[PDB]
Amino acid sequence: MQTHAARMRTFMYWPSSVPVQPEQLAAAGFYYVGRNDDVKCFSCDGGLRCWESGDDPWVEHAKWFPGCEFLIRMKGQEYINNIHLTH
Ligand SMILES: [Zn+2]
Ligand SMILES: [Zn+2]
Protein backbone atom coordinates (compact mmCIF):
# COMPACT_ATOMS: atom_id res chain seq x y z
CA MET A 1 0.00 0.00 0.00
CA GLN A 2 3.02 2.27 -0.43
CA THR A 3 1.74 4.05 -3.55
CA HIS A 4 -1.26 6.33 -4.18
CA ALA A 5 -2.27 4.02 -7.06
CA ALA A 6 -2.30 0.83 -4.91
CA ARG A 7 -4.32 2.52 -2.15
CA MET A 8 -6.87 3.73 -4.76
CA ARG A 9 -7.52 0.13 -5.83
CA THR A 10 -8.94 -0.67 -2.36
CA PHE A 11 -11.59 2.07 -2.67
CA MET A 12 -13.61 0.59 -5.55
CA TYR A 13 -16.50 -0.32 -3.20
CA TRP A 14 -16.22 2.69 -0.89
CA PRO A 15 -19.75 3.51 0.23
CA SER A 16 -21.50 6.11 -1.91
CA SER A 17 -23.04 8.00 1.01
CA VAL A 18 -19.76 8.88 2.77
CA PRO A 19 -19.06 12.62 2.41
CA VAL A 20 -15.30 12.01 2.13
CA GLN A 21 -14.05 10.10 -0.93
CA PRO A 22 -11.12 7.95 -2.20
CA GLU A 23 -8.87 10.47 -3.99
CA GLN A 24 -8.36 12.58 -0.86
CA LEU A 25 -8.18 9.53 1.39
CA ALA A 26 -5.60 7.69 -0.68
CA ALA A 27 -3.51 10.87 -1.13
CA ALA A 28 -3.36 11.16 2.67
CA GLY A 29 -1.95 7.60 2.96
CA PHE A 30 -5.21 5.77 3.71
CA TYR A 31 -6.53 2.58 2.22
CA TYR A 32 -9.94 0.91 2.68
CA VAL A 33 -10.12 -2.15 4.96
CA GLY A 34 -13.51 -3.15 3.48
CA ARG A 35 -15.87 -2.56 6.42
CA ASN A 36 -18.14 0.44 6.90
CA ASP A 37 -16.08 3.64 6.33
CA ASP A 38 -12.94 2.27 8.05
CA VAL A 39 -9.53 3.20 6.62
CA LYS A 40 -5.92 2.69 7.73
CA CYS A 41 -2.68 4.55 7.04
CA PHE A 42 -0.01 2.49 5.31
CA SER A 43 2.77 4.11 7.38
CA CYS A 44 1.58 4.63 10.97
CA ASP A 45 -1.21 1.97 10.88
CA GLY A 46 -3.61 4.50 12.42
CA GLY A 47 -7.23 3.77 11.53
CA LEU A 48 -10.03 6.32 11.12
CA ARG A 49 -13.82 5.85 10.79
CA CYS A 50 -17.08 7.83 11.23
CA TRP A 51 -16.13 10.41 8.61
CA GLU A 52 -18.28 13.57 8.72
CA SER A 53 -19.32 16.34 6.29
CA GLY A 54 -16.37 18.78 5.98
CA ASP A 55 -13.69 16.32 7.15
CA ASP A 56 -10.31 16.59 5.37
CA PRO A 57 -8.25 13.39 5.42
CA TRP A 58 -4.96 15.33 5.99
CA VAL A 59 -6.36 17.33 8.90
CA GLU A 60 -7.74 14.19 10.50
CA HIS A 61 -4.38 12.42 9.93
CA ALA A 62 -2.59 15.30 11.77
CA LYS A 63 -5.25 15.53 14.52
CA TRP A 64 -5.06 11.88 15.53
CA PHE A 65 -1.69 10.61 14.36
CA PRO A 66 0.69 13.62 14.40
CA GLY A 67 3.82 11.47 14.80
CA CYS A 68 3.24 9.62 11.49
CA GLU A 69 6.41 9.51 9.38
CA PHE A 70 4.46 9.75 6.12
CA LEU A 71 2.49 12.74 7.32
CA ILE A 72 5.65 14.60 8.45
CA ARG A 73 7.48 14.06 5.15
CA MET A 74 4.43 15.14 3.09
CA LYS A 75 2.89 18.09 4.97
CA GLY A 76 5.74 19.09 7.30
CA GLN A 77 5.73 19.85 11.02
CA GLU A 78 4.43 23.42 10.76
CA TYR A 79 1.24 22.12 9.14
CA ILE A 80 0.74 19.64 11.97
CA ASN A 81 1.45 22.32 14.61
CA ASN A 82 -1.20 24.56 13.06
CA ILE A 83 -3.86 21.78 13.17
CA HIS A 84 -3.42 21.57 16.97
CA LEU A 85 -3.29 25.31 17.43
CA THR A 86 -7.12 25.45 17.19
CA HIS A 87 -8.33 21.87 16.61
ZN1 LIG B 1 -0.11 7.76 9.10
ZN1 LIG C 1 -3.84 18.69 19.89
UniProtKB/Swiss-Prot annotation:
Expression across tissues: Present in many fetal and adult tissues. Mainly expressed in adult skeletal muscle, thymus, testis, ovary, and pancreas, low or absent in brain and peripheral blood leukocytes.
Residue sites binding Zn(2+) per the record: C41, C44, H61, C68
Location of this chain's protein in the cell: Cytoplasm; Nucleus
Post-translational modification: Auto-ubiquitinated and degraded by the proteasome in apoptotic cells. Upon stimulation of death receptors, including TNFRSF10B, recruited to receptors and cleaved by caspases. Proteolytic fragments remain associated with the receptors. This cleavage presumably inactivates the protein.
First and last residues of every BIR repeat: 4-71
The organism's place on the tree of life at top rank: Eukaryota
UniProt note: domains: The BIR domains mediate nuclear localization.
Subunit structure of this chain's protein: Interacts with DIABLO/SMAC and with PRSS25; these interactions inhibit apoptotic suppressor activity. Interacts with CASP9. Interacts (via BIR domains) with TRAF2; the interaction is required for IKBKE ubiquitination. Interacts with E2F1, RIPK1, RIPK2, RIPK3, RIPK4, BIRC5/survivin and USP19. HSP90AB1. Interacts with UBXN1. Interacts with GSK3B. Interacts with several death receptors, inclusing FAS, TNFRSF10A and TNFRSF10B. Recruited to TNFRSF10B in the absence of receptor stimulation. When TNFRSF10B is stimulated, further recruited to the receptor and cleaved by caspases.
Summary of the function given for this chain in its UniProt record: Multi-functional protein which regulates not only caspases and apoptosis, but also modulates inflammatory signaling and immunity, mitogenic kinase signaling, and cell proliferation, as well as cell invasion and metastasis. Acts as an E3 ubiquitin-protein ligase regulating NF-kappa-B signaling and regulates both canonical and non-canonical NF-kappa-B signaling by acting in opposite directions: acts as a positive regulator of the canonical pathway and suppresses constitutive activation of non-canonical NF-kappa-B signaling.
Family membership: Belongs to the IAP family.
Name this protein carries in UniProt: Baculoviral IAP repeat-containing protein 2
Source species of the chain: Homo sapiens (Human)
Higher taxonomy: Eukaryota, Metazoa, Chordata, Craniata, Vertebrata
Residue window of the full protein shown: 266 to 343 of 618
